[PDB]
From a paper:
As a starting point for this work, in a parallel line of enquiry we unexpectedly observed a low-affinity interaction between the [name] [name] domain and a 17-residue peptide derived from the [name] corepressor by 2D NMR. We refer to this [name] sequence as [name]; it is distinct from the [name] sequence BBD1 which binds to the lateral groove of the [name] domain with high affinity. The low-affinity NCoR1BBD2 peptide, 1RERIAAASSDLYLRPGS17, significantly improved the crystallization of the [name] [name] domain, giving initial hits in 21 conditions of a sparse-matrix screen. The structure of the BCL6BTB/NCoR1BBD2 complex was solved to 1.39 Å resolution [Fig. 1(a) and Table 1]; only the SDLYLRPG sequence of the peptide was resolved. Crystallization of both the BCL6BTB/NCoR1BBD2 complex and the NCoR1BBD2-BCL6BTB chimera was favoured in conditions of high ionic strength, and the crystals had similar cell dimensions and the same packing in space group P6122. In the crystals of the BCL6BTB/NCoR1BBD2 complex and of the NCoR1BBD2-BCL6BTB chimera, the NCoR1BBD2 sequence simultaneously interacts with two regions of the [name] domain: the first is the β1 strand located in the lower part of the lateral groove of the [name] domain and the second is a region we refer to as the hydrophobic patch (HP) located on the surface of the [name] domain between residues 60 and 72. A peptide molecule thereby tethers two [name] dimers together in the lattice [Figs. 1(c) and 1(d)].
Here, we report the functionalization of the [name] (bric à-brac, tramtrack and broad complex) domain from the transcriptional repressor [name] to serve as a promiscuous assembly block that may assist the crystallization of a guest protein. The 129-residue [name] [name] domain forms a symmetrical strand-exchanged homodimer that contains two lateral grooves that bind corepressors with high affinity. We showed that these can mediate the formation of a variety of highly porous lattices, and that a guest protein may be incorporated into a [name]-domain lattice by its genetic fusion to a corepressor peptide that binds to the lateral groove of the [name] domain with high affinity. We have shown that the surface of the [name] [name] domain contains versatile interaction interfaces with the potential to mediate diverse lattices in a range of crystallization conditions.
Numbering used by the authors:
A (entry chain B), B (entry chain B): 1734 to 1741
C (entry chain A), D (entry chain A): 5 to 128
The structure:
Amino acid sequence: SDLYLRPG
Amino acid sequence: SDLYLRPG
Amino acid sequence: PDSQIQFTRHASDVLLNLNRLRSRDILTDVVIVVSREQFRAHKTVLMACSGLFYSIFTDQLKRNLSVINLDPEINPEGFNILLDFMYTSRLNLREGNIMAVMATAMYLQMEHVVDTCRKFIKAS
Amino acid sequence: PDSQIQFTRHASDVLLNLNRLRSRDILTDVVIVVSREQFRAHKTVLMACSGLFYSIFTDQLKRNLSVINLDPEINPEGFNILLDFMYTSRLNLREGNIMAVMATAMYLQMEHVVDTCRKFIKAS
Ligand SMILES: [Cl-]
Ligand SMILES: [Cl-]
Ligand SMILES: [Cl-]
Ligand SMILES: [Cl-]
Ligand code: NA
Ligand code: NA
Ligand code: NA
Ligand code: NA
Ligand code: NA
Ligand code: NA
Ligand code: NA
Ligand code: NA
Ligand code: NA
Ligand code: NA
Ligand code: NA
Ligand code: NA
Ligand code: NA
Ligand code: NA
């Protein structure tokens, strides 16, 4: 995937 | 590490 | 046969340093105007991220504009979110801004951002 | 508490697009000269990668130079290897160029490259 979620 | 080796 | 040395953090370090230049107004060469609000930037970063800006600055007549006005119906916060994305790789999509961000990304011809907006709209 | 969306390939895509601009001579704004050999580049990329270029283009008098000459004792291929590194994250170190690359990187104040050269010299 070209996206990931990470801490704000 | 800040470096890695990969194919030429 | 040769192998290659690659620096893991080089590209993100370059972007971080370019964003620091932008924050300090160093070597910025264009102001983008949306509904009387101004955003300073580096033309090359804009061209590297946006099909619209690539088209503008490859046009001989428009290449040397120092101020670019966008369609005043564009949401300037949507533009600001996309400008920050260009310089950071982080896209601040929220329920309350996703439609404005998507419309602005379509206008700026940022196809990967548009695809991402469509993904989040479809999931919700 | 908010979380963030990050695009994995954004920074490397920006660098790839900047390198394409360099190859096509689009929006390049400086020529670097080493021993009668010329290299076109974008000032902002140079400043983002090199302490020397950051110092030059933040000096009011030097900011608007369009041609910069480096010490003619510098190896121009060492410079070319470092310029390619700036725009690609890949550092073409070889037994036959490592000393020239290290000396050039020290001159350009590229501390991470210098550390990497010292690592490979020590290992061999
Ligand atoms: Cl400046
Ligand atoms: Cl995009
Ligand atoms: Cl041009
Ligand atoms: Cl470095
Ligand atoms: Na940043
Ligand atoms: Na800075
Ligand atoms: Na043209
Ligand atoms: Na034209
Ligand atoms: Na103008
Ligand atoms: Na508007
Ligand atoms: Na918002
Ligand atoms: Na490239
Ligand atoms: Na190009
Ligand atoms: Na100064
Ligand atoms: Na000065
Ligand atoms: Na000059
Ligand atoms: Na030389
Ligand atoms: Na070489």
